[PDB]
Design an enzyme around this catalytic site. Structure first.
Site, PDB file in Angstrom:
ATOM      1  N   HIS B  96      -0.010  -2.098  35.793  1.00 49.21           N
ATOM      2  CA  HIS B  96      -0.937  -3.189  36.075  1.00 49.21           C
ATOM      3  C   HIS B  96      -0.519  -4.248  37.092  1.00 49.21           C
ATOM      4  CE1 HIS B  96      -4.698  -4.641  33.624  1.00 49.21           C
ATOM      5  NE2 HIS B  96      -4.960  -4.467  34.907  1.00 49.21           N
ATOM      6  N   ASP B 119      -8.003  -5.565  28.379  1.00 48.78           N
ATOM      7  CA  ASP B 119      -6.578  -5.401  28.131  1.00 48.78           C
ATOM      8  C   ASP B 119      -6.199  -5.938  26.752  1.00 48.78           C
ATOM      9  OD1 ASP B 119      -3.697  -5.392  28.471  1.00 48.78           O
ATOM     10  OD2 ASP B 119      -4.031  -5.653  30.615  1.00 48.78           O
ATOM     11  N   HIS B 121      -3.471  -7.394  26.603  1.00 45.00           N
ATOM     12  CA  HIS B 121      -2.694  -8.517  27.131  1.00 45.00           C
ATOM     13  C   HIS B 121      -3.450  -9.287  28.217  1.00 45.00           C
ATOM     14  CE1 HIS B 121      -0.247  -4.985  26.075  1.00 45.00           C
ATOM     15  NE2 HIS B 121       0.480  -5.862  25.404  1.00 45.00           N
ATOM     16  N   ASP B 123      -1.694 -10.700  30.812  1.00 46.05           N
ATOM     17  CA  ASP B 123      -0.891 -10.516  32.019  1.00 46.05           C
ATOM     18  C   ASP B 123      -0.989 -11.738  32.930  1.00 46.05           C
ATOM     19  OD1 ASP B 123      -0.432  -7.972  31.009  1.00 46.05           O
ATOM     20  OD2 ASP B 123      -1.881  -7.007  32.351  1.00 46.05           O
ATOM     21  N   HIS B 136       4.267  -6.365  35.573  1.00 45.50           N
ATOM     22  CA  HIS B 136       2.933  -5.918  35.160  1.00 45.50           C
ATOM     23  C   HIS B 136       2.323  -6.880  34.137  1.00 45.50           C
ATOM     24  CE1 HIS B 136       4.108  -3.318  31.360  1.00 45.50           C
ATOM     25  NE2 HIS B 136       4.883  -4.381  31.475  1.00 45.50           N
ATOM     26  N   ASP B 227      -7.186  -1.651  31.660  1.00 46.24           N
ATOM     27  CA  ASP B 227      -5.863  -1.255  31.203  1.00 46.24           C
ATOM     28  C   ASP B 227      -6.165  -0.377  29.992  1.00 46.24           C
ATOM     29  OD1 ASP B 227      -3.412  -0.949  30.037  1.00 46.24           O
ATOM     30  OD2 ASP B 227      -2.847  -3.067  30.142  1.00 46.24           O
ATOM     31  N   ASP B 229      -4.427   0.361  27.517  1.00 45.93           N
ATOM     32  CA  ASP B 229      -3.902  -0.105  26.245  1.00 45.93           C
ATOM     33  C   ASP B 229      -4.803  -1.170  25.628  1.00 45.93           C
ATOM     34  OD1 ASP B 229      -1.225  -2.202  27.604  1.00 45.93           O
ATOM     35  OD2 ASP B 229      -3.280  -2.757  27.059  1.00 45.93           O
ATOM     36  N   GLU B 272      -2.077   1.792  33.553  1.00 45.77           N
ATOM     37  CA  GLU B 272      -1.142   2.025  32.457  1.00 45.77           C
ATOM     38  C   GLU B 272      -1.180   3.369  31.721  1.00 45.77           C
ATOM     39  OE1 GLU B 272       1.358  -0.016  32.141  1.00 45.77           O
ATOM     40  OE2 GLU B 272       0.656  -1.823  33.174  1.00 45.77           O
TER      41      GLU B 272
END
Ligand SMILES: N=C(NO)NCCC[C@H](N)C(=O)O
Ligand SMILES: N=C(NO)NCCC[C@H](N)C(=O)O
Ligand SMILES: N=C(NO)NCCC[C@H](N)C(=O)O
Ligand SMILES: [Mn+2]
Ligand SMILES: [Mn+2]
Ligand SMILES: [Mn+2]
Ligand SMILES: [Mn+2]
Ligand SMILES: [Mn+2]
Ligand SMILES: [Mn+2]
Lengths: 313, 313, 313
Positions: B96, B119, B121, B123, B136, B227, B229, B272
């Site tokens: 990412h 995501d 996250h 980030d 990332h 992303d 995840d 990712e």
């Protein structure tokens, strides 16, 4: 009320054979006993004896047309009888091509019926739009009146008579619809709740709208054709055409609990259970157990519990 | 419209190497063919050749700053070009950290873009707030204008220019945010829908609000940085930083179907995906298949079905 | 505020023994440290020493009545003390029969408490309605005032005093309720949200209504008795009485996050975690990890993130 069980060990609507074992594994799961265990009056009309049709070459692309047409024809008669006995017909399949006979037989006694079709597919391909040639993906086309005229003279189905209008059916769970099938959906204006609408509205609103759509004008007999592949394969893997992202176990139970509460359930189909396709013995029991749970829910079993009209204290 | 595919086999934004195989496994999943199979006009600009930077010691805590800054710099140029060719850029990652180059390049042609960041996250760590030192987890900090001034002179990123405001981005799927990151979220007033809001409102309302939030004032280009995840690891396990309790396969498809329907999708990132981290070969295909499904949905594939403007009957 | 941890390694409320290991595996999961890691003031009152009662034959059908009555009696005293120390009691079980002592002890210091009972079961059977004779399925009957009079003189429970009204409790997650139990639910008018209502309304509205139902009139101490089998077994398999179709990991976290935000959490129970029943070592850690996550959420851990009152930039 009362129930009328009828086994339909038939597979010729599609390629894989194991599906004819459906009635067997479901009955083995103790379905008849579990039902009686509830306030249910159960009568088993047995497994139908499906005559072997050795001479059944394809009609253009369509496979085993005579065998499918015959099995659906027999089932129709069997369903009409149980209905003439004042019982809720429960057809244990068997591939989904049998719905032609089940809804047909059911409509003979109750022509104003409404159909709720839980499936990952619409099974509305016509002999000319189908690409697989498998009849378990065309039942609905033989039943609609708006389509009568786009269906050729297919060997084995001259007994058929379109008994439902495009507006007497609702689909729930769709996530794999062919191009021609989508065209029919939009062209005839069929009410459906694909997985997209389920994600958007939630299964509660979907059911509210479905029952409202079919029972708004007035109350009428309800026919539920339940294809086990409507539920995500993590719940029902032992089936021929599994598709990821399906309805959850909970959503499956919610749909059936809501239908029971209407008190209008008239006909029920539990189709596409194939014990032979379970990657493991647990995959098979997981599929049969879930299929049985949905059925019991159709007849009263509630997650909040049940109790007889008596003082338990 | 039309699509512009660009592979970004880059991993230096984080520790595990397998992520650079992303473009390979996704293309192997038949992504370009599946797209063409739809009403899609696809042009592949190939996998970018990421020059090797042997001399790249850390900047304080930040690791491989020159390699990341260079790869993002190259990507930016590549994206701006495909956009100048009137095509929807599709960046296949890659970690990412590349979003710095993707959104940067995209904003060169369309400065009024809106970003939706799916995501687990945010980030949004800065070189000074990060604790891992992995880039990332900092892309967003380099892109916001409100943060320009809290970012030191990091080797490799002197080409960067904050191109988005705190109110031109919406997060969806958050379930693992660091303390400093949360501070920035609340301080800058960033619109986000953590897993908590998704559970509270449902994915339908979340999307309604997200698109309403970014397109209320007026219509503008949309950039989706996806992303893998962000989705629960039961759907995408072959990824570096998996977090339990993520978005479902269905919710993932719902988000993308809604974005497509806007007709404003302008840039897309699928990041990712790490084939090396799949505990099993099935875990790898499960991740790639889901990643491909989300992508196809971004370009029109609907669960209710599709059909060309013609009479199928 | 502050927390008061108390381990309750007790299993005699049911057949399987492994449940007494609950406090051990949860503490081993680093629960006390994870809590301190948050803005939590933790005090561990240790694992209670449950005296062995060799002579404890059944009372009619009821098994180990003296052992259960004694363990609940001891716990009650322990909870009342931690509460008199101004701390949120956290009881690590142990089977659910202990709730008799936990809610009893809690009500000694705060008689106006409200109870939220997350479970797949109602555990409201009476000594005369129970069919299993296992006391972990009868705690609630000993606590309600409306039922005082339907409960015989059971050895070990002469210290008990019904401390809650039928309208000071809300069930969430029900999917396996006995006939007699359902009768009590409907007869006393208990507010509950079975899995059916959760599917219909969504966990967001359920929590809105639950907190509204218990805190409408006025604010008062809240006691949360969390049975891990309330969550679907795909998240918490290492438990004695698992039932399919339960609350998801997300829904579990949503419930607890909402309770924390009220700032009224006063007592908490984490029950039925049995490490011995995990079909695999991963099944055990999966159960313990989820149980720990729900607990941390009860004390502030938010999925959107947390941050201390300071300037992180
Ligand atoms: N099992 C089913 N439906 O339930 N199969 C139908 C499948 C797919 C495709 N539409 C066809 O006609 O082949
Ligand atoms: N893969 C990602 N995000 O998508 N990693 C970022 C991870 C965690 C942490 N916030 C960090 O900066 O290390
Ligand atoms: N673990 C529990 N509840 O949490 N067990 C109670 C179980 C079932 C049944 N109602 C009984 O009284 O036996
Ligand atoms: Mn079907
Ligand atoms: Mn199907
Ligand atoms: Mn990311
Ligand atoms: Mn991430
Ligand atoms: Mn319990
Ligand atoms: Mn329970």
């Amino acid at each position: 009320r009362t129930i009328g069980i009828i086994g339909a060990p038939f597979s010729k609507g599609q390629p894989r054979g194991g599906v004819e074992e459906g009635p067997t594994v479901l009955r083995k799961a103790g379905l008849l006993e579990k039902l009686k265990e509830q306030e249910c009056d159960v009568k088993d009309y047995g497994d139908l004896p499906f005559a072997d049709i050795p001479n059944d070459s394809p009609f253009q692309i369509v496979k085993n047309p005579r065998s499918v047409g015959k099995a659906s024809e027999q089932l129709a008669g069997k369903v009409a009888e149980v209905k003439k006995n004042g019982r809720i017909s429960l057809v244990l399949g068997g591939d989904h091509s049998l719905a032609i006979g089940s809804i047909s037989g059911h409509a003979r006694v109750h022509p104003d019926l409404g159909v709720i079709w839980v499936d990952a597919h619409t099974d509305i391909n016509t002999p000319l739009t189908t690409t697989s040639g498998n009849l378990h993906g065309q039942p609905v086309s033989f039943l609609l009146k708006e389509l009568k005229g786009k269906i050729p003279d297919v060997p084995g189905f001259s007994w058929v008579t379109p008994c439902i209008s495009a507006k007497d059916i609702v689909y729930i769970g769709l996530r794999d619809v062919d191009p021609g099938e989508h065209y029919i959906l939009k062209t005839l204006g069929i009410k459906y709740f694909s997985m997209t609408e389920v994600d958007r509205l939630g299964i509660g609103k979907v059911m509210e709208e479905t029952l409202s759509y079919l029972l708004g004008r007035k109350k009428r007999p309800i026919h539920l054709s339940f294809d086990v592949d409507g539920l995500d394969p993590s719940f029902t893997p032992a089936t021929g055409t599994p598709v990821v992202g399906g309805l959850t176990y909970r959503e499956g139970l919610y749909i059936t609990e809501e239908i029971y509460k209407t008190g209008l359930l008239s006909g029920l189909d539990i189709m596409e259970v194939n014990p032979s396709l379970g990657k493991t013995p647990e995959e098979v029991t997981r599929t049969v157990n879930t299929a049985v749970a949905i059925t019991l829910a159709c007849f009263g079993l509630a997650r909040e519990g049940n109790h007889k009209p008596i003082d338990y204290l």
